[PDB]
Structure formats: C-alpha cells, structure tokens
Design a protein around this ligand. Sequence first.
Ligand SMILES: Nc1nc2c(ncn2[C@@H]2O[C@H](COP(=O)(O)OP(=O)(O)OP(=O)(O)O)[C@@H](O)[C@H]2O)c(=O)[nH]1
Ligand SMILES: Nc1ncnc2c1ncn2[C@@H]1O[C@H](COP(=O)(O)OP(=O)(O)CP(=O)(O)O)[C@@H](O)[C@H]1O
Ligand SMILES: Nc1nc2c(ncn2[C@@H]2O[C@H](COP(=O)(O)OP(=O)(O)O)[C@@H](O)[C@H]2O)c(=O)[nH]1
Ligand SMILES: c1coc(CNc2nc3ccccc3[nH]2)c1
Ligand SMILES: [Ca+2]
Ligand SMILES: [Ca+2]
Ligand SMILES: [Ca+2]
Ligand SMILES: [Mg+2]
Ligand SMILES: [Mg+2]
Ligand SMILES: [Mg+2]
Lengths: 346, 436, 54, 425
Amino acid sequence: MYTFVVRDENSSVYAEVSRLLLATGQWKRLRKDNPRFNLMLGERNRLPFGRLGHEPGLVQLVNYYRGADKLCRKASLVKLIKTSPELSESCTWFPESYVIYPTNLTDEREVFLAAYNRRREGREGNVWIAKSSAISSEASELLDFIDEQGQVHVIQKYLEKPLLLEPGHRKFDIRSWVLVDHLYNIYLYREGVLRTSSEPYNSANFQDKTCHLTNHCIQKEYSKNYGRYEEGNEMFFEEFNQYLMDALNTTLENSILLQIKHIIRSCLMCIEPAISTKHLHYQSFQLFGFDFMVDEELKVWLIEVNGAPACAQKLYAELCQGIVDVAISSVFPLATSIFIKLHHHH
Amino acid sequence: MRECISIHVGQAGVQIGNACWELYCLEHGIQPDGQMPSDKTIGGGDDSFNTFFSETGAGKHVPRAVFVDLEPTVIDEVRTGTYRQLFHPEQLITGKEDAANNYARGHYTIGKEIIDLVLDRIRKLADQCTGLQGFLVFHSFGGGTGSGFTSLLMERLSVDYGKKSKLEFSIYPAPQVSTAVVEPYNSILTTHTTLEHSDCAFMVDNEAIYDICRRNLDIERPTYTNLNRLISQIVSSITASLRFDGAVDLTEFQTNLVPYPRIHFPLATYAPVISAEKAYHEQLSVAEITNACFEPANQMVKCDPRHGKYMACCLLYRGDVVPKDVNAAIATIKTKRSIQFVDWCPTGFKVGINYQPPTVVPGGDLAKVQRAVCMLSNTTAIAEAWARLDHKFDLMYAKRAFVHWYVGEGMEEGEFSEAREDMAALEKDYEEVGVD
Amino acid sequence: MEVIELNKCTSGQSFEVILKPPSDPSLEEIQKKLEAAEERRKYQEAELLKHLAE
Amino acid sequence: MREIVHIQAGQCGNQIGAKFWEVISDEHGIDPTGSYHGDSDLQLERINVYYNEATGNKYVPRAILVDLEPGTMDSVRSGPFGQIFRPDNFVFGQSGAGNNWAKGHYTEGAELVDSVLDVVRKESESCDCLQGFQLTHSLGGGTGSGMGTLLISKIREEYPDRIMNTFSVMPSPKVSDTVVEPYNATLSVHQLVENTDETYCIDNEALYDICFRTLKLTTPTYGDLNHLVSATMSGVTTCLRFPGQLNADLRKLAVNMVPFPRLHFFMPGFAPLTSRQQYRALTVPELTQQMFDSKNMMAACDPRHGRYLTVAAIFRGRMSMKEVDEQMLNVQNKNSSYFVEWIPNNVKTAVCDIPPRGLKMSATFIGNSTAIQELFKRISEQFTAMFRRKAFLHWYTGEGMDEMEFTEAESNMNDLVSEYQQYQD
Ligand SMILES: Nc1nc2c(ncn2[C@@H]2O[C@H](COP(=O)(O)OP(=O)(O)OP(=O)(O)O)[C@@H](O)[C@H]2O)c(=O)[nH]1
Ligand SMILES: Nc1ncnc2c1ncn2[C@@H]1O[C@H](COP(=O)(O)OP(=O)(O)CP(=O)(O)O)[C@@H](O)[C@H]1O
Ligand SMILES: Nc1nc2c(ncn2[C@@H]2O[C@H](COP(=O)(O)OP(=O)(O)O)[C@@H](O)[C@H]2O)c(=O)[nH]1
Ligand SMILES: c1coc(CNc2nc3ccccc3[nH]2)c1
Ligand SMILES: [Ca+2]
Ligand SMILES: [Ca+2]
Ligand SMILES: [Ca+2]
Ligand SMILES: [Mg+2]
Ligand SMILES: [Mg+2]
Ligand SMILES: [Mg+2]
C-alpha cells in the first residue's frame, strides 16, 4: 500500500492523478503535513526539496524537477539559451530575445537598441513584444512600458508572418505536453492542441491585441468570435493534420512535429546534468507544457515552457492515466503507449 | 613546532576519537605501547607528528588529547583496550550518570560541576605546548553531553584561550542509528550557543556514513565500529596536513574555507570507499576519484551542491597523485559538472598532495587504495541540513513536547525560541549568499 | 587555467589552480548563567517539597 | 554500576514481583540459592543492576517485600526462589489493609511505612549510583494501592531526582475482588500522575481475555495472569539487564518516551502468545503483526481508538537485524493515522541476542498511546456510579477521609482524560 500527499489544491492535472491513484485501492492519501509518503504532489512555489529522500526505507518521488525554473521563467529561459553552448545565441528556433530590467532596479538594453536600430535602418520588420512572467514597432514605447512596471521583462521579436488558418485568416499556437520520468526518458504526448484565435489577424493594428494573442483566457473574454470555427478555440492534431493535407499537401508529423520533437529534446538534454535525479537520494518527474509558434514558411518557433501546465479538457483522462502508468507506477508498480519516446544519449 | 589539543566529548566523540588515534598511530608507525622506532630524537623533537603527540623520557609518544564523558561505560573501554598504554589516567575524565539526552542537563545541571576539572586537565596539556594552536573538538549533536557540555566547554575555552582557534567535528543525528527523539532540540540548542565560539565545523551526517557503508562496503546492518573506522579516514585526511610535511596550521582552515564567520560549515567528500571483502578492484584514476568528489553519494552530508553556490574548494590527495593528472581531471570535470561560485570569490581549487597513501586498519572494512582524495567545499547546499532539523524542531516545539525535561534542569523556555530564531537567521544568511 | 604557488618536498606537494578571477561573554557572565539556572532548579524543587509537606 | 531498587507491596504486588524475580533469575543464571551457574558472561555483564553481590559470589535480589498482612509474604518465602530474598527485606505487619486505600495510605499503612523506608535507605546507601526505583502492585486493593502510592510519595521526597517507575495492575469488572476497587484505583491513579516517571498499565481483564481467547485457557488463574506479567516485566527491562548498543538508563529512557509530564502511562505488549503448534518457528513478520495487534496488548485498549505518542519495540533472539528494521518500518506506513506526525521518528527498535527461556525469539511492546484514556474512562465511570450515591463511602470516611478528597481524585483523573483527548486531535 503506497502513500502520497497533495500540496497544491489548485492543480487540475494532479487532482485527477490523486483521483486515479485512490481508485486503484493500492494508494492511500495522507495529510499534507505527514512525511511518511512514497509520493508528493507538491506546491508550485518554494517546494522544500531539501527535506526529501531522508526517510529510511521509503523510496520518495516528487512531481517537480529541482531546477526546471531555468526553463520555464521568461527571463530565465532567454538566459539559458544565449549562455548555453548546446543552444548557442545563434539558436535557429527561438526568437531573438533580450532581458530588460526596469530602470528602477546583466541588462541587455543597449544590446537590444543596437539590433533594433539595425532593423529600422534596413527597411525590415521591427515589431517587437514585451512580456513578463508576472506589442509595438517603436523602441520608445516598449522600453517606457517596462519602466512603468517593476519586474524583469523580456523583449523578443514579434513573429510578423505567422501561419494563418482558413477560413478565418487567424493566428494560433501549439501546446505539446512532455513527461520526463525519473530515468529521464523524454515522452511526448501523442496528443497536442492548437489554441487558435477567432479573429482575422491584422498586421496594421497591434493596438487591438485580440488577433495577436492566442491565450485561452483572452479569447474567451475579449474576442467576439469565440467558438465559431472550433470548440473552445482548440483544434487537435487530427483536424489540424487533415487541414495541412488539404491546404498545403503535407502532414503534421513531417511539417511541424519533427521540429517540435527536436526542440523538446534540445532543451531537456541541455539541462540534464543539472536536474537529473540519477544518483540522488530522491527521484523526480515533471510534466511540461511547451508552447510553439508556426510561421508561414512552416518553421516551428519556441514561445515558452510552462512548468505547471493545465491540460485540454478532452485529454485530461488519457494524459493523466499515462502519468500514473509511466511516471508513478514505473517507480511503484501495482499488483500501446500514448507517448512518443525521444531516445537520446544520457 | 606548534601543538594541537584534541577534545572528545560524549559517547560519539570518544568512540570516534578512539578510531582516529588508532589510525594516527598506524600512520605514524606508533605501536600500542607508545613507541616509535622511526623517531630517532628520543624524548623530544619538533617534527610534523609532534603537533599531535608528545614524547616522554622513556620514548613514549602520548596523544595530546582529552576524553570527557559524564558516564564511565564508554571511556572504560579505552582504559582497557589495545591502546590503553598510550594515554595516562589524567587524560580520561568521567562522571557517574550521563545527561540522559538532555542538553540542559549536560550544559547546566551536570556541566557546572565538572567544567572546572576538565579545564584544569586541559591546562596540564597546554602547559606542555611551546606554541599552542587550538583544539579539535569531537562531539555529537544529539547527545546530551555531546551537545550540552560541548557548548559550555567552548564558552570557557574562548575565555581561557582567547586567541586560539577551535574546530569541531560534529555528528549530525540520523534516525537509522539513533533511538533518541529529542536530538533536534539538542542540535539546535548546541549550534546556537556554540556558533560564535567555533571557527570551522565539519558535520558528519550519520545518515550519509550509513548508506556509504551499506552501498560501498556491503554491510547490511553497520555498527558504530564500521561507522567510526570510516569517519576517522575522513578526519585523518583533513588533519593529515597538521601531522605530515604537506600543505599546515589550524589558522589556514578558516582562512581557506570560511570567508563569512557564521558560514563555517564546510562539506566533506571522500573517495574511493572500496570494500576489502572485494576480490580486487580497478584502481580508480585521479580523474575518476576526483570526479567522484561531485557525486552526493560520497558526501558526509546528503545534499545537492548543484543547486547551491560554492565559496571554496580544497582537494586533499593522498597516495600516487601528481599535479599534471589533477589539472587534467579538473578541466574534464568543469566541462561536465554544475559548479556555481559566488561572484565575490574566485573560481578555483587549492590542492595538496601527500604521497603516502591512505592507511587502513588491519582486519578492517576499508580496502587499501593507491590514491584517495578528500574534498572540502563550502557550499550553500549544506543549508539543507539546517532546514531538515529546524523543521523537526518546529514540529515538536509547536506542541511544547519534551520541553519540561529541559526546564526541569533550570533552562528557560525562551532559550528554545531564541536558539530557533538564530537558526532562522542562519538559514537566511545561506539563502542571501547562494540564491539569486 | 593558471597553476600557482607550486610547493614541493619529499612527502608531497601543494599548488593552486585558478579557472576564473572574482567579480564574547566573560567568565563572570558564564558563572551567572550557570548559577541562575541552578537557582531556578532550587526554586522548582522547593515548590515540590512545599507541596509535599502540605 | 547503575543499580535499581525493587519494591513489591500488597498481595498482587508481591506475587507478581515474585514471579518476576523467578523469571530474570533464570535468565541471569542465578538459582534459588543465589549462586551463579550460567554459561555466558552477558549474564553477569549487568548483574548488579538488580542483584547485590554477597560473600562467596552470591547474588541477592535488591528487592524489598512489603505488605500489611503476612499471608502473601509467607508464600514467597516458602516459594520456589523464596530463600533467595534478603531476610531483612521482608517488611510486613499484621492488621492488613482490608482492601481499603485509606487504611494502606493513612492509618494501618502509616504505622509501617517508616520501617520500609529504613530498608530502602539501606539499599540506596550501598548503590554506587542508584538509577531509580521500580514498584509492583495492584490499584484495586489496599496495601499495594493505598500504601504503595504512599511509599512512592515518601520516596520522591527523600530521592526527588531519582526515577520512579511502577508496574500497576488495573482492576477490571471482569476480574474483581471487591466493589470498592474503583474507589481504590481512582485514588491511586491521582498519586501516579504526580509521582511516577513510567507506569505500565496492566488491565486484568486484558490478561484474562488473552489467557482465555488466545492461549485457549478455559479457566484462567491469578497464576496464569502473572506468567504474562513476568514475561512483560522481563521484556521491558532487557535493555537494562543485558549489554547492547542501546545503553541507556532509567532517565534516558523516560526522556525519550514521555513528551508531557503527566502522560507517562504505557500499554505493554508481548509476543508471541501461543497456545499448547507451540514449537513452530516464528518469523520476523509474525512477531511484528501480533506485537502491534490489539489482542497481544495488556491494557484492554484498542490502539486504533487513539494515537501513539511514542513506541518502543525490543526484540530478543538470534534474528536478522536488517530484516527487523525492514518489518518495523513497514507497520508504521500501513497504519500512519495512529501515529502523531508532530514527534519525528517516534518509533524506536532495540535488539538483544539472549531470548527468554524456551523461545527462539520474542518481542516486547511498549506503547505510549492516547487510547489509554479508555482504561481511565472505565475506571472513572465505575467510580462515579458509586460516588454519586456515596455508596460504600463509610468504609473510607470512617478511616479519616472526607468526601472532598474523593471529589478531587475524581476531577484529577477526568482532567488526565481530557489531556489525552486534546493530543489525540
Ligand atoms: N558516528 C557515530 N555516531 C554516534 C556514535 N555514538 C553515538 N552516536 C550518535 O550520537 C547520538 C547520541 O549522542 P551520544 O554521544 O550517544 O550521547 P552522549 O554524548 O554520550 O551524551 P549522553 O546523553 O549524556 O549520554 C546518536 O544520534 C548517535 O547516532 C558513534 O560511535 N559514532
Ligand atoms: N514573439 C512573438 N511573436 C508572435 N506571437 C507571440 C510572441 N510572443 C508571444 N506571442 C503570443 O503570446 C501568446 C503566449 O504568451 P506567453 O506564453 O508569453 O504568456 P503566458 O505564459 O501567460 C501564456 P501560456 O503560459 O499559456 O503559454 C501566444 O499565443 C503567442 O501567439
Ligand atoms: N494479575 C494479578 N492481579 C492480582 C493478583 N492478586 C490480586 N490482584 C488484583 O489486585 C486487586 C486486589 O488487590 P490486593 O493484592 O488484594 O490488594 P492488597 O491488600 O494491597 O494486597 C484485585 O483487583 C485483583 O484483580 C495477582 O496475583 N495477579
Ligand atoms: C524498570 C522500570 O522501568 C523499566 C523499563 N523502562 C523502560 N523504558 C523504556 C523506554 C524505551 C524502551 C524501553 C524502555 N524500558 C524497568
Ligand atoms: Ca622525537
Ligand atoms: Ca574565538
Ligand atoms: Ca494499629
Ligand atoms: Mg507562463
Ligand atoms: Mg553516554
Ligand atoms: Mg486479598
């Protein structure tokens, strides 16, 4: 009889995992402060990693890798890409980004202006975007908007030529879910989702950000065509695969999946020696939400990586059962995989 | 030549000291009766080993050590053991009833009565030193005498020996080998009153030594013998530079490893630990044993140095080790490991090579190796050990459990929260220096 | 990768390799703490004996 | 040399104490005459803890036998090991206590106590370093109940910083001498709450049920019940009488088992308990399930009705210490709800190499659980059922007590129950 605890009541993903574990009759849930647990579904912030792996006779497993915030924090990811040789500053699938600190606080302000002035002089598109974990073609507006805030921000090249779906002439992003187990096998969930925009993309008006941001909460609040083309502005790999064939005469595997699989591998392999729980006194596993952009040349770009992602309402059952199968049951065995293993060198 | 006095306090300190001085004799070729054929200067000399042994007119080499325990059962073993002839009676001090795992009982109730006697015995050794450097205090965090009397002895040492350095070898309490439930209280009580008085303290988590014994030595249920025989290896390698001609003085330990005073808790790493019962093993290269210094499985305290920041790193090599191979492995490891130094400190390594390889106790558990390295590193990841304890402390103190046993000995309940507020600050100090 | 202060002798040698440059209470008081604790012990034991004589 | 002074008062006290000394005498290789005849030195390693050494290499139990009537102590002196006891250590009167706590505590006992203490002092004066005292007695009688608590009070006065543990037999309605036992038990318990460091609660109903339901004894006897109390008393003391990494004195043990001063009441357990299939070897798992089973516990309290503050398991025999550690670590995770989570690592295990006579291996259980309140509730219920109507009170008021002292002993034990209740949540 295995035991586990729950320290994040807001987690929709692991609210179902705990539900499934109990349904097995072989797992028992304890109070959130009881330390005799085989598994911990821990809190997002300030998770006490230092207290794990020190219970005699108990193999302990946690659902967060210590150090993955380097990959999921906007300002942390930019720093990991430019400074890591495996990725290099010349990484071809990540938009040219810069870490800007508000003037009320290194910082890449001058390095950003240099690249910004270079574009303005070459008649090239120069529409950037500022964001933070907490759109404009003018450098003054972007830098002034950051000074009006008080946290770290990032200015990265806004993709001015995004692949637009028809009918609609609309933008979108792709969410892929990757599960990394204790042995550090990289499993890609065969099921992805496209969080699309229900408004015709407009390159002459970045002021109205409803046709530029594909977030599920912004579309269901400020967009007037929510749910017109697909339910909940969410299209799945089967329909998107069929549209690619009819319109572009290609496939999702060849056109986009191959690049996504490469991006996933490249990022997780880069920080493997830094978060691997191979020779550690406890074991880790984490589910990642990767967000991609696809331009009009069928090139896949990396947006960000979410360390505590939610899932599409239709995929909660299949994905969660797979977490238990390959992530939890693989360490605590009970009495065709929905994942695509991304083989690599450890 | 400058002398060093060792002070063993409590059950843990005495037994560990017994295992250390055993190794010291085998290393310096001193027989159980105290004779040393290799020493040609009879009755005197200022050699590298004289920092730890004194010489009599009869040629007996006597350790500069003192054993203290409020109970006579542990020190009686030394009085009749193989090495009984090494020490004289004045060096072994014992009471008649221990501190019952109660810090207050050792610090206030019993300590008061035996404190002036211990200091006087120490003064007798000090009266034999031509240039005393400091003291090496072995004790346990959980023991009532080890935690309670040590803290009092330290306070009095900083008074009677102001300018002398003091180093601790502290045993971090582990549940797998301890039957005591209050050791968190004692640990936090002793690290509080002892902080301002210790200049550098090496913690040994019994949890670490235990798994090192089961994993590397294939001992299903290890004993204190098995645990001490190992610890003395790590202690020997850390003290080897004081007894042999290699680099030298106790002042170097703080200067080299402790930039900020409160953060005087280095992390030790030792390799290779090979089982003598093994038929034969591939003699690990300098690169391999040096690469082992960054596996947590070889650390005296279990923690992740990849998620802290370093402040210093020494590599104490013993055996067949040459500088060319050390730098080769180092460059190899830098391009593979996660080693983050603080910005106010350089990113480098002090290295000392001693050509005589590590000595092993005959019939012991440790196999003879051709080259061994002990790394001393001041990581902020050792703050995990304080977090672990401070949590347990908080769990019980919230219900005031076991507090009456302490107050029953004259200690005030405020000394608990006072000691805890000090550990909360010590945890903050580490996070300030190590996190961004 | 700079090796410095290479020190050698017959029993061993020592050196330093750099990879990158940088960027008390008195005896009076102790006797009081000890006696004050012994005084609280005396008062608690007194209250015990008083309750026992009653 | 950490000597322990033993005391046994009253009929039950002396009879149980007697069998106890019979049990450990055999374990330490001491025959009925005081001579040593063992084949191992572990038997003499810690012999002075419970035995004095006389001329001719004789070992005399450091036991002081006390009673108001002579009946029982004449039995012991003519018992199997009777002649082993120091003839001076027999302190007894003639009036008897009439199964009345007042008589043993205030009147008949008051006249004999000073002579008992004279003997205690004589034994203490020869103890190189006295560990503390242990008392055997019942709480439903008058002598061991009334005078035993009186002795304890007078011992704490003369030796205030010495450990005072007791083995106390709780009266049950199933094995009852007199109807006033609830009066005597309640009056004794109040004394034990104040003046004892360890009190092992032994409910006769539990011993009975064990002898009946488990051991398959149709008609159990006070002699059958006492055999169990001999084995348990021998078990909880193995860490004291034999050498091991445990070490520990009476004070080191209490500090680690008693987190709150007045919650120092334990429910002991023994295992195996086998009916005469009696020669079958017992595996390390089987010792452990029974040990934590409620039927093998002697407090008539269901541990699943409370939470453990602390727990200590002492194993005896040639078994796998690795496998021992494995099984103990398994029980706690199976029943986590019954252990408090604010006392880290509150389950301790000790191993000894000498097994009890005739057993390949045994397990002694010591439990500081909050379920022990049910034992006190039963006592308090029976007590009030009588006291509300002042039934049988004249037997006590006649001896000099007032109704007020009864109302105090009532409230004091109901507070003890509430205390146990708050920590169970
Ligand atoms: N590594 C190691 N740890 C020990 C040894 N002896 C005791 N310990 C640890 O010390 C802790 C208890 O402190 P002790 O040293 O035994 O107690 P003490 O210092 O004699 O003080 P008292 O309570 O008065 O006896 C336990 O957690 C043990 O794990 C030993 O020989 N080696
Ligand atoms: N450089 C760029 N070019 C084009 N679009 C961009 C962009 N940077 C961000 N976006 C848009 O912003 C959206 C994602 O914003 P971002 O991910 O930074 O905020 P967020 O983290 O709160 C949403 P989530 O965590 O769910 O991915 C995407 O839908 C994308 O269309
Ligand atoms: N287990 C056990 N209980 C006993 C024994 N003798 C008496 N009792 C219990 O003790 C109570 C009576 O106490 P008793 O010994 O007669 O009181 P005394 O006057 O002090 O000797 C009753 O509740 C009995 O159940 C015995 O030999 N074994
Ligand atoms: C005489 C009076 O008490 C005794 C035995 N006490 C005792 N405390 C213990 C605490 C933990 C484990 C065993 C213990 N055993 C003998
Ligand atoms: Ca000499
Ligand atoms: Ca000083
Ligand atoms: Ca009379
Ligand atoms: Mg985000
Ligand atoms: Mg001791
Ligand atoms: Mg009778």
